């Protein structure tokens, strides 16, 4: 613990502030590794600012990487840390101009919701996740639509029976009768998990 | 600039020993010539044109303002059908090559004859063996017709120009085996009606007999393209006064080879003015000659000429250098040269240069000198009396050289002729209009000729239709294009297509694609949200 707290943190902060983009590709891997290795008492004050300043960089590569490697972060930092400041960091990765980060966030949110406690799950879903879902469904890009159609059919057992007819059925019928076949192939290949 | 002349006549349908007709072999030879010329790092400025044996509105396939794509597309779809009208086709090609000459300033006919204003062009005139026809019989003279001369063409009296060479390919490939392979490195002549026409311009005429000989002649033709400076030499009048190291006795007299005027546009001065005595008042100008009749005299006459005179390096192509090599290339000595046909008021020829060789004794440098150098080089009221022997207009270029030192002359006597300036702008405007009209209707064929002309032997006006190649029958739009065999099935197909209410409906039954299917062209009209950052 002392060796990573004394000398590895300065090295990581200097590598995170590099003027090159290819170094963040592996800096985010080092970050998730040290976050999974370290205990809970040394995350909310050491690794959070670095990932926060790296997830909002001028390049889209580091944003794509932190969007991919997000389940390990949200499962290692615990639910409370995800409740404090991970909500904006996850929201800024769904409202970008590049479709890669949005598709990655859509693919990861399904299992991100799986490791969420039942104290503020439905609230943050009906208050914050629902507007992002509604604004990403009506997007013109086909890749994000196909990703959503392939990933959103796994959140039905989490919301419950009385929550599918609320908002899941409209988006399902919208993605079903779409113009491109790529999104239909994904929305029709995952219809058995909503039968129960 | 290269203008390929492929006849595509009906006589080019006979099959070779390989299995392809002469037209296919000619097109393949053109393609291999393209891929061979592309090896030299100088094919980024040339332009390719195509000329066939067709009507004047249909003879030209690709001319000015035509890229390589349309040229290759027109050469691809060449059809061999028609008579062998060689004279009319050569005339059309020469008129096409001389469309933008009277507008830019080349061959102005009023201010000397500048050799540094070049427009190179090489004709291949790939035709058949012999027996050319003109819709009446078989001629054996090959005379170019003169029916509609271009405005401003009576001042040259010859169709070809200063830099227009003419090579020929006959493609005399046997039909059985083409086993004639005795001489390996030997390319004989064709000995046909096109041979004198080619030799007059300055290019030989190859005789293709085997594919190996075809490759040899194509590899020998790519080394004969450069700046076109073709001048004619004559032995008169010295009676072979080459008594330097041996005794003379020759065929190296009427040399009509070219000269390589490589630039450092070309840079140079002191041109060959003309061959006549120009008067101050001359309404009609005598017609010039495409090849200047300039003659050399074998005299030492102080070959050492060193001065601040602007230097020229118009390299001469070695074709008749045997007569010079017989005299050890004339080391440290030269021989004067002079243009004939009344170069001055009253005299026969005036020495205006020499043919001194280089120190390396490789080729002739063609040292071009002023009109009369041995007098102005070596003021006590001398230059004012000396400037009366030179032609008037000739004071134009030389004064520029005097600009290097000072400016004693002016525009007082800088006048060629009061009548030569007139009737010149109108001719240039007419030539520009003709060139525009020719370049406008160059690719738009618009034949619209499909009739049988039913003769009596609704009256006197009937004509049965012919089979249209590119008809593209509309099966879903037009009901007349549906034959009787596949009528009910096609009826059900049209019914299902109309009752489907799909998006972006069409009237074509099955339109797969065109002849070409590019990958990038189809992939460009798509969207792929990916960059492969890893």
Swiss-Prot record, chain A:
<feature type="repeat" description="HEAT 7">
    <location>
        <begin position="43"/>
        <end position="81"/>
    </location>
</feature>
<protein>
    <recommendedName>
        <fullName>Serine/threonine-protein phosphatase 2A 65 kDa regulatory subunit A alpha isoform</fullName>
    </recommendedName>
</protein>
<comment type="subunit">
    <text>PP2A consists of a common heterodimeric core enzyme, composed of PPP2CA a 36 kDa catalytic subunit (subunit C) and PPP2R1A a 65 kDa constant regulatory subunit (PR65 or subunit A), that associates with a variety of regulatory subunits. Proteins that associate with the core dimer include three families of regulatory subunits B (the R2/B/PR55/B55, R3/B''/PR72/PR130/PR59 and R5/B'/B56 families), the 48 kDa variable regulatory subunit, viral proteins, and cell signaling molecules. Found in a complex with at least ARL2, PPP2CB, PPP2R1A, PPP2R2A, PPP2R5E and TBCD.</text>
</comment>
<feature type="repeat" description="HEAT 10">
    <location>
        <begin position="164"/>
        <end position="196"/>
    </location>
</feature>
<feature type="repeat" description="HEAT 6">
    <location>
        <begin position="4"/>
        <end position="42"/>
    </location>
</feature>
<feature type="repeat" description="HEAT 8">
    <location>
        <begin position="82"/>
        <end position="124"/>
    </location>
</feature>
<feature type="modified residue" description="N6-acetyllysine">
    <location>
        <position position="83"/>
    </location>
</feature>
<comment type="function">
    <text>The PR65 subunit of protein phosphatase 2A serves as a scaffolding molecule to coordinate the assembly of the catalytic subunit and a variable regulatory B subunit. Upon interaction with GNA12 promotes dephosphorylation of microtubule associated protein TAU/MAPT. Required for proper chromosome segregation and for centromeric localization of SGO1 in mitosis. Together with RACK1 adapter, mediates dephosphorylation of AKT1 at 'Ser-473', preventing AKT1 activation and AKT-mTOR signaling pathway. Dephosphorylation of AKT1 is essential for regulatory T-cells (Treg) homeostasis and stability.</text>
</comment>
<feature type="repeat" description="HEAT 9">
    <location>
        <begin position="125"/>
        <end position="163"/>
    </location>
</feature>
<comment type="similarity">
    <text>Belongs to the phosphatase 2A regulatory subunit A family.</text>
</comment>
<comment type="subunit">
    <text>(Microbial infection) Interacts with JC virus small t antigen; this interaction inhibits PPP2R1A activity.</text>
</comment>
Curated annotation (Swiss-Prot), chain B:
<feature type="domain" description="VWFA">
    <location>
        <begin position="1"/>
        <end position="225"/>
    </location>
</feature>
<dbReference type="GO" id="GO:0160232">
    <property type="term" value="C:INTAC complex"/>
</dbReference>
<dbReference type="GO" id="GO:0034243">
    <property type="term" value="P:regulation of transcription elongation by RNA polymerase II"/>
</dbReference>
<dbReference type="GO" id="GO:0071168">
    <property type="term" value="P:protein localization to chromatin"/>
</dbReference>
<keyword id="KW-0597">Phosphoprotein</keyword>
<dbReference type="GO" id="GO:0005634">
    <property type="term" value="C:nucleus"/>
</dbReference>
<dbReference type="GO" id="GO:0015629">
    <property type="term" value="C:actin cytoskeleton"/>
</dbReference>
<dbReference type="GO" id="GO:0160240">
    <property type="term" value="P:RNA polymerase II transcription initiation surveillance"/>
</dbReference>
<dbReference type="GO" id="GO:0016180">
    <property type="term" value="P:snRNA processing"/>
</dbReference>
<comment type="function">
    <text>Component of the integrator complex, a multiprotein complex that terminates RNA polymerase II (Pol II) transcription in the promoter-proximal region of genes.</text>
</comment>
<dbReference type="GO" id="GO:0034472">
    <property type="term" value="P:snRNA 3'-end processing"/>
</dbReference>
<keyword id="KW-0158">Chromosome</keyword>
<comment type="subunit">
    <text>Component of the Integrator complex, composed of core subunits INTS1, INTS2, INTS3, INTS4, INTS5, INTS6, INTS7, INTS8, INTS9/RC74, INTS10, INTS11/CPSF3L, INTS12, INTS13, INTS14 and INTS15. The core complex associates with protein phosphatase 2A subunits PPP2CA and PPP2R1A, to form the Integrator-PP2A (INTAC) complex.</text>
</comment>
<protein>
    <recommendedName>
        <fullName>Integrator complex subunit 6</fullName>
    </recommendedName>
</protein>
<dbReference type="GO" id="GO:0004888">
    <property type="term" value="F:transmembrane signaling receptor activity"/>
</dbReference>
<dbReference type="GO" id="GO:0032039">
    <property type="term" value="C:integrator complex"/>
</dbReference>
<keyword id="KW-0539">Nucleus</keyword>
<comment type="similarity">
    <text>Belongs to the Integrator subunit 6 family.</text>
</comment>
<dbReference type="GO" id="GO:0005654">
    <property type="term" value="C:nucleoplasm"/>
</dbReference>
<dbReference type="GO" id="GO:0030674">
    <property type="term" value="F:protein-macromolecule adaptor activity"/>
</dbReference>
<dbReference type="GO" id="GO:0000785">
    <property type="term" value="C:chromatin"/>
</dbReference>
